[PDB]
PDB file of C-alpha atoms in Angstrom:
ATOM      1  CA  UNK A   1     110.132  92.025  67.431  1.00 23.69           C
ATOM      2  CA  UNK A   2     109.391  90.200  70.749  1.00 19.61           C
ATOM      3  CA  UNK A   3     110.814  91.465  74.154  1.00 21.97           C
ATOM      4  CA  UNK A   4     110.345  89.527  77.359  1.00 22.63           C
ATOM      5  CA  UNK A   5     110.349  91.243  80.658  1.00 16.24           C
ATOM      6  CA  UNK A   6     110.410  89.554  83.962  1.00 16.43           C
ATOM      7  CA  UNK A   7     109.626  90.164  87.588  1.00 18.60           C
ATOM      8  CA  UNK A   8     109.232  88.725  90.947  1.00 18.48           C
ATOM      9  CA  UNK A   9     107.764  89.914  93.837  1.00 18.34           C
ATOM     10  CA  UNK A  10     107.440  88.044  97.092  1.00 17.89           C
ATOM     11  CA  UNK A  11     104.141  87.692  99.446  1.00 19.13           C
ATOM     12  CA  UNK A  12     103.615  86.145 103.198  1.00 21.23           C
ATOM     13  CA  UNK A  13     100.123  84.523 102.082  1.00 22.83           C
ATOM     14  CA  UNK A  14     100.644  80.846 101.082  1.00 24.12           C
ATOM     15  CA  UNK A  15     100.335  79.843  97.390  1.00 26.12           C
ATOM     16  CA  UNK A  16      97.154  78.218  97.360  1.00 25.01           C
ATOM     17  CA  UNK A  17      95.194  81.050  99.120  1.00 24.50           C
ATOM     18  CA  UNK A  18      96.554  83.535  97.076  1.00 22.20           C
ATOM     19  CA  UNK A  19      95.662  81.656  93.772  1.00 20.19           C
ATOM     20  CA  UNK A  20      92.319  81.928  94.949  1.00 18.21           C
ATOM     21  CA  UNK A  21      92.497  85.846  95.904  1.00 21.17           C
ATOM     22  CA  UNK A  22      94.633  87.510  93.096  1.00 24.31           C
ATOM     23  CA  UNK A  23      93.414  85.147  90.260  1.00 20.60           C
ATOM     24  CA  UNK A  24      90.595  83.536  90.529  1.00 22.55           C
ATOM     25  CA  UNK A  25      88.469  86.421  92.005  1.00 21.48           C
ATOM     26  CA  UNK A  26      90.565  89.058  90.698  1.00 20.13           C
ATOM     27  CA  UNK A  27      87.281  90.465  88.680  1.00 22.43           C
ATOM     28  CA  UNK A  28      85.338  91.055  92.535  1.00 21.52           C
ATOM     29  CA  UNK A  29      89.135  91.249  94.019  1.00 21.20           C
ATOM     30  CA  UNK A  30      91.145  94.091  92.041  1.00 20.68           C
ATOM     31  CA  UNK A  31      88.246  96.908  91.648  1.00 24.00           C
ATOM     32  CA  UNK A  32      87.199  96.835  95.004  1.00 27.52           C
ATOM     33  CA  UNK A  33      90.976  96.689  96.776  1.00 26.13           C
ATOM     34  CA  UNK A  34      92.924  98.968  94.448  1.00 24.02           C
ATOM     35  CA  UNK A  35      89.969 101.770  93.028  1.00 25.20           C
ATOM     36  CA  UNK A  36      92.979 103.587  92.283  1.00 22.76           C
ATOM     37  CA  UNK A  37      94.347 100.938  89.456  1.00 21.63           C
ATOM     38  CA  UNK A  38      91.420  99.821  88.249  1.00 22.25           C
ATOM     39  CA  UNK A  39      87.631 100.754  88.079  1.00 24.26           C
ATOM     40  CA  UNK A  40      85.729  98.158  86.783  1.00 21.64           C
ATOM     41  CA  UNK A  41      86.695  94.474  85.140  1.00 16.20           C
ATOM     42  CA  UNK A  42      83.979  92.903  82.805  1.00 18.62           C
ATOM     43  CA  UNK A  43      83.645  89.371  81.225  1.00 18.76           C
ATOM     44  CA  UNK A  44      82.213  90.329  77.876  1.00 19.34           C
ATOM     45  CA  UNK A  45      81.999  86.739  77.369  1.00 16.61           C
ATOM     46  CA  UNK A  46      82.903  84.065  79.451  1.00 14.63           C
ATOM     47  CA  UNK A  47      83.463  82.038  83.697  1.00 15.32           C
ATOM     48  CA  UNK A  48      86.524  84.145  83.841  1.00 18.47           C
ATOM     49  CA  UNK A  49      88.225  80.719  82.601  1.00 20.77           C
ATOM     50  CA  UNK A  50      90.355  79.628  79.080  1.00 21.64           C
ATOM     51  CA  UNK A  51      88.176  81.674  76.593  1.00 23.95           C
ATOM     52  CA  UNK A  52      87.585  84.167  78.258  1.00 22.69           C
ATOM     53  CA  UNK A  53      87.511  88.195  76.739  1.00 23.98           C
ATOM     54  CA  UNK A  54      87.627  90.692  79.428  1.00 29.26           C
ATOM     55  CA  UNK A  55      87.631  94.378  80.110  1.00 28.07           C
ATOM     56  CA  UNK A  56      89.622  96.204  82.344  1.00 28.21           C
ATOM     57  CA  UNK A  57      89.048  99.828  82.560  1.00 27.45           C
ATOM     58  CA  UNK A  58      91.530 102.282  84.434  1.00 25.20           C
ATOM     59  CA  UNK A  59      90.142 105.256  86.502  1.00 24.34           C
ATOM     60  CA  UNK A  60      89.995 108.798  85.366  1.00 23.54           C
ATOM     61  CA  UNK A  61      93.257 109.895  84.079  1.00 22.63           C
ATOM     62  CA  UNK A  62      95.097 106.840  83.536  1.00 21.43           C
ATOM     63  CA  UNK A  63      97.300 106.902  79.791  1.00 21.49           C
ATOM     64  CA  UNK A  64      94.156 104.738  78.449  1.00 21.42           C
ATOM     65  CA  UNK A  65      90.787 103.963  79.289  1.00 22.61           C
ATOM     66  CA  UNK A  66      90.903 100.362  78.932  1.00 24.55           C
ATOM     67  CA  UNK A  67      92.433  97.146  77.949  1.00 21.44           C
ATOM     68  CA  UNK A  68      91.210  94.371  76.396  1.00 26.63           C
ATOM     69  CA  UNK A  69      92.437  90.713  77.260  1.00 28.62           C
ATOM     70  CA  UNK A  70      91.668  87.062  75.964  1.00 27.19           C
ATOM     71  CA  UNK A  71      92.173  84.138  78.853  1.00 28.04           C
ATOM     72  CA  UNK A  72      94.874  81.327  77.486  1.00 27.83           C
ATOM     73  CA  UNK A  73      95.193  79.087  80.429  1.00 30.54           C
ATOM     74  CA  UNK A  74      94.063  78.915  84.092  1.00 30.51           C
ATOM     75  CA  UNK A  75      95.947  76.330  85.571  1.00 31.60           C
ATOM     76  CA  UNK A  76      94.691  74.979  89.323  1.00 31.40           C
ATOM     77  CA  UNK A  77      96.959  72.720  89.534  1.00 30.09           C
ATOM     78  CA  UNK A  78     100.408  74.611  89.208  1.00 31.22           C
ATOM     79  CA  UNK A  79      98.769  78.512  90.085  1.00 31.53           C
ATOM     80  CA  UNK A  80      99.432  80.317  86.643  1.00 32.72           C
ATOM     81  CA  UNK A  81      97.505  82.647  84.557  1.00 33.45           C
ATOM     82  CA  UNK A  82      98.047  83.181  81.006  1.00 34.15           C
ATOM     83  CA  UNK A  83      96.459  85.902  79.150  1.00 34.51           C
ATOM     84  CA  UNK A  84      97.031  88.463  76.187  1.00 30.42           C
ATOM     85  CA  UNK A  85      96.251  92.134  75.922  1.00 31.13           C
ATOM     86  CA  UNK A  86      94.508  92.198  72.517  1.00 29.02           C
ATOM     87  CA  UNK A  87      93.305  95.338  72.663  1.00 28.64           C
ATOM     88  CA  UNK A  88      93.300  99.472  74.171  1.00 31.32           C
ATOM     89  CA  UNK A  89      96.385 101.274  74.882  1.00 31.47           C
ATOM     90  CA  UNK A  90      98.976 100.937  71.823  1.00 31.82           C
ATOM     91  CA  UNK A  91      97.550  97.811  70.735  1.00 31.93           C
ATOM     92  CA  UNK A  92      96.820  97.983  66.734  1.00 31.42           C
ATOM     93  CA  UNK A  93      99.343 101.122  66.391  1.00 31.25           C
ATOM     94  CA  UNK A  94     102.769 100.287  68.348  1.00 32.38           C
ATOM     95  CA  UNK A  95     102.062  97.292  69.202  1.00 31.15           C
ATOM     96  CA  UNK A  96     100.589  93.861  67.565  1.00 33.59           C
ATOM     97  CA  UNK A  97      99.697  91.500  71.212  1.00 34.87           C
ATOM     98  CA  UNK A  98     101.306  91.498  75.129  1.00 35.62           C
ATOM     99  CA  UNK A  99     101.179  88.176  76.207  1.00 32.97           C
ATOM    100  CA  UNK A 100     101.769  87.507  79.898  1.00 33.04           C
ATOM    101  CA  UNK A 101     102.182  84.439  82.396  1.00 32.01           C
ATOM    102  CA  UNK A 102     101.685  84.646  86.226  1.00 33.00           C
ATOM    103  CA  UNK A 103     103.046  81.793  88.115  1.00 33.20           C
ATOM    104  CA  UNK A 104     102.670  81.320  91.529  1.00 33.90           C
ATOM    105  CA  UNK A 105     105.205  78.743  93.491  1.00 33.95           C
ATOM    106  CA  UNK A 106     105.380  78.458  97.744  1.00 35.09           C
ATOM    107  CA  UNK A 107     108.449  79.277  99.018  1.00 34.66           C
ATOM    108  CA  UNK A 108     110.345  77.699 102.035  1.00 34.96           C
ATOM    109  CA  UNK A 109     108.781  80.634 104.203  1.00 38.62           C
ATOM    110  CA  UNK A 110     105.214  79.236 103.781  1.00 40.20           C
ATOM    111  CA  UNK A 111     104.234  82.557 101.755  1.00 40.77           C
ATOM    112  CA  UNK A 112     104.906  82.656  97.464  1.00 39.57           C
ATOM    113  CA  UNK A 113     107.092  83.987  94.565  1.00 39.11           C
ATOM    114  CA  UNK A 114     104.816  85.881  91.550  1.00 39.58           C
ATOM    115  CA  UNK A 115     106.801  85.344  88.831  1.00 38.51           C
ATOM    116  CA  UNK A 116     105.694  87.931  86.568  1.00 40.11           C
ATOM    117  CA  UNK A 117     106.667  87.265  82.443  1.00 37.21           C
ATOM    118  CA  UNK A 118     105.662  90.375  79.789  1.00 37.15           C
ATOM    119  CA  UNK A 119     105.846  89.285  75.837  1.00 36.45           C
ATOM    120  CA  UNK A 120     105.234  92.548  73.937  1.00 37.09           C
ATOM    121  CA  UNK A 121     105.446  92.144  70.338  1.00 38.00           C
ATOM    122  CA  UNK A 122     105.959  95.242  68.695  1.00 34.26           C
ATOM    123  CA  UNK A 123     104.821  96.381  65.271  1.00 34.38           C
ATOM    124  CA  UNK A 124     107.398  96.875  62.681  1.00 34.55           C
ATOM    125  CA  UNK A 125     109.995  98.609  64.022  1.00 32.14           C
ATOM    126  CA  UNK A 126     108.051 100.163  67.039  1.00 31.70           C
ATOM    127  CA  UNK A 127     110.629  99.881  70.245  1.00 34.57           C
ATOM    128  CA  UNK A 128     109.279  99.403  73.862  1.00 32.79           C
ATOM    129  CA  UNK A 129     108.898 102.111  75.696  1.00 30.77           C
ATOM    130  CA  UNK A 130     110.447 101.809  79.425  1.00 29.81           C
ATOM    131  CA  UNK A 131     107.701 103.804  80.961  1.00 33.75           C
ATOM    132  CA  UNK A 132     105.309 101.114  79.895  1.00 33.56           C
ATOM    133  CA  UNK A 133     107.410  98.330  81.121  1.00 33.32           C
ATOM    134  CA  UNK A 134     107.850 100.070  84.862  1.00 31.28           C
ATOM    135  CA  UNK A 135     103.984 101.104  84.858  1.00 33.99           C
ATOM    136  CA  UNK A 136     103.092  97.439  84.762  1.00 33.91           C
ATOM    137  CA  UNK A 137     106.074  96.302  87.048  1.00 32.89           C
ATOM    138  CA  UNK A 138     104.673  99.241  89.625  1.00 32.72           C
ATOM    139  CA  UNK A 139     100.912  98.285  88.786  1.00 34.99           C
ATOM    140  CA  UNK A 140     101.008  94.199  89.651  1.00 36.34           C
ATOM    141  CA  UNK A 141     102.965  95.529  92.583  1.00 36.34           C
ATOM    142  CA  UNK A 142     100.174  97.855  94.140  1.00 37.51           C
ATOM    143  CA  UNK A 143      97.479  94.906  92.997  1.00 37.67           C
ATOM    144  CA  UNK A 144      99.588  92.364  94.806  1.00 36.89           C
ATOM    145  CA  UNK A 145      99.836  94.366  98.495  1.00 36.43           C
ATOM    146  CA  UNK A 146      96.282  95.657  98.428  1.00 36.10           C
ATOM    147  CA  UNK A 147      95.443  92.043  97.670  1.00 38.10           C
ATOM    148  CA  UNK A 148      97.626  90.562 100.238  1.00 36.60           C
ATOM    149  CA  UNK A 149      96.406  93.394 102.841  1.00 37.94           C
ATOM    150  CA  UNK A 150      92.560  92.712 102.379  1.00 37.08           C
ATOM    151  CA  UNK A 151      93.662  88.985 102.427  1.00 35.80           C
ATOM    152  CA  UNK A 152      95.611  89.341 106.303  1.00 35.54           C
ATOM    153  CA  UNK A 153      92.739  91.864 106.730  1.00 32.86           C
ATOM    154  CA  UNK A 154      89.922  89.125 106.623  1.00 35.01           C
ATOM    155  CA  UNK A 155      91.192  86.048 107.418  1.00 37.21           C
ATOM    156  CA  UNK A 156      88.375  83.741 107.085  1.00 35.28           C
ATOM    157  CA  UNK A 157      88.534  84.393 103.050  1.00 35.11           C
ATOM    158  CA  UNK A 158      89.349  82.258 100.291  1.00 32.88           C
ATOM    159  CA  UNK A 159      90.403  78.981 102.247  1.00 36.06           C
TER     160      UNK A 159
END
């Protein structure tokens, strides 16, 4: 089956500069402002853009070691991010792909909306587990405030 979960989570830096931070330069960007999500990101082939495989491993004593994820869509124009985890974690036993959009739109404020949308399609009968949905709900949560922190932190970057 296929079960869509959605978030939202707000941020005080403005659309276009946080394009820039959280996706484009995510690979430099998430290892080196949240060491305790993530340890290391490789491009095992690819920019980073539509084509793109890439690594992400987790640090000692995460569930799983590592995911694997192919790079759908990089959109500049409207600030989204599609991508599917094709591999690691449950992938191959529970379940068959996760696909996931990040959109980002301005809001009224000046700062943005992440609109967060998870596609996990299971294997067989395989149900989602909640723990899995609320450990990536909490992780693009501590990504997004160490992001926007280093971003308010140094703010001569990505403009």
């Amino acid at each position: 089956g296929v079960f869509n979960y959605e978030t939202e989570t707000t941020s005080v830096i403005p659309a276009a500069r946080l394009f820039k931070a959280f996706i484009l330069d995510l690979d430099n960007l998430f290892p080196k402002v949240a060491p305790q999500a993530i340890s290391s990101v490789e491009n095992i082939e690819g920019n980073g853009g539509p084509g793109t495989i890439k690594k992400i491993s987790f640090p000692e004593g995460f569930p799983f070691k590592y995911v694997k994820i192919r790079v759908d869509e990089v959109d500049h124009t409207n600030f989204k991010y599609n991508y599917s985890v094709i591999e690691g974690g449950l992938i191959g036993d529970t379940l068959e792909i996760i696909s996931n959009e990040i959109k980002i739109v301005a809001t009224p404020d000046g700062g943005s909306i992440l609109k967060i949308s998870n596609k996990y399609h299971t294997k067989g009968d395989h149900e989602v587990k909640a723990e899995q949905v609320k450990a990536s709900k909490e992780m693009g949560e501590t990504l997004l405030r160490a992001v926007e922190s280093y971003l308010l932190a140094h703010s001569d970057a990505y403009n």
